[PDB]
């Protein structure tokens, strides 16, 4: 139904080891489709999904130009950030940026994003109105005053409402076989005794797309959030994802536990239990 496009920039300085590395990746939902790395033998925006390969030379050349311009801009931004935080030129620092658009089933803009960080912390974010800024500290306030003077928010709004949504629609159409296909989880429950009176029940979800999923354990119909071990959703490497949730239960009480699975590819939420 709903979809997103997101670009992620990482600019990392490295004193004594050349100019800052700039790496950009683009995603539609949980599918990466482009990359740029300033450390590549010949840096260019390059395809990472089959449905983007059909785009012609004007696309790839334009995108490469934009990425090199961006790399220059963010090397400069690292230099500026040093001054804003009274920092020495000897340390390594990182600027991160994530931006993009969310659209609904009818392809219309749900909302836009443009958020930046410095050394892992919030720096400045475009507000949901796409016209004002939230700065995390006084340095970012300097940047904010600059962007207000230059009406940068207006240009960003123009991009997010225009090109971002239009090209996202285009990508969704060219890659509809995959981008518009949800793969439901393959689910099962495993049982491993740990002692004579306790056992681990582990609820598995495999091979699902997109990554969004909910796995919960219930005991006698009550959620066991505090007692559940939940691993981070992880990529399988074939576009799909994996996750599990585990609970330690008293021996002989296994049937009082049920695993509940929610995913977009499932018409209804699943309930499963250990089947000895």
């Amino acid at each position: 139904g709903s979809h997103s496009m997101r670009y992620f920039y990482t600019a990392m300085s490295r004193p004594g080891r050349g100019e800052p590395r700039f790496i950009a990746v683009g995603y539609v939902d949980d599918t990466q489709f482009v990359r740029f790395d300033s450390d590549a033998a010949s840096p260019r925006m390059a395809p990472r999904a089959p449905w983007i390969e059909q785009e012609g030379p004007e696309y790839w050349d334009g995108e490469t130009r934009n990425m090199k311009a961006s790399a220059q801009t963010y090397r400069e931004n690292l230099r500026i950030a040093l001054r804003y935080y009274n920092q020495s030129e000897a340390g390594s620092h990182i600027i991160q940026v994530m931006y993009g658009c969310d659209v609904g089933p009818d392809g219309r803009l749900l909302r836009g994003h443009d958020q930046s960080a410095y050394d892992g912390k919030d720096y400045i974010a475009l507000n949901e109105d796409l016209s004002s800024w939230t700065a995390a500290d006084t340095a970012a306030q300097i940047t904010q005053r600059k962007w207000e003077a230059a009406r940068v928010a207006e240009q960003l709004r123009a991009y997010l409402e225009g090109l971002c949504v239009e090209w996202l629609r285009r990508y969704l159409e060219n890659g509809k076989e995959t981008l518009q296909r949800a793969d439901p989880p393959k689910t099962h429950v495993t049982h491993h005794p740990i002692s004579d009176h306790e056992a681990t029940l582990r609820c598995w979800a495999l091979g699902f797309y997109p990554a969004e999923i909910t796995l919960t354990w219930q005991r006698d119909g009550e959620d066991q959030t505090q007692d559940t071990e939940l691993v981070e959703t992880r990529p399988a490497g074939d576009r799909t994802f994996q996750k599990w949730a585990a609970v330690v239960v008293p021996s002989g009480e296994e049937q009082r536990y049920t695993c509940h699975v929610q995913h977009e590819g499932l018409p209804k939420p699943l309930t499963l239990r250990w089947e000895p």
Partner: peptide
């Protein structure tokens, strides 16, 4: 398609 907007800090 990436953003063409320049963001100088």
């Amino acid at each position: 398609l990436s953003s063409p907007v320049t963001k100088s800090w």
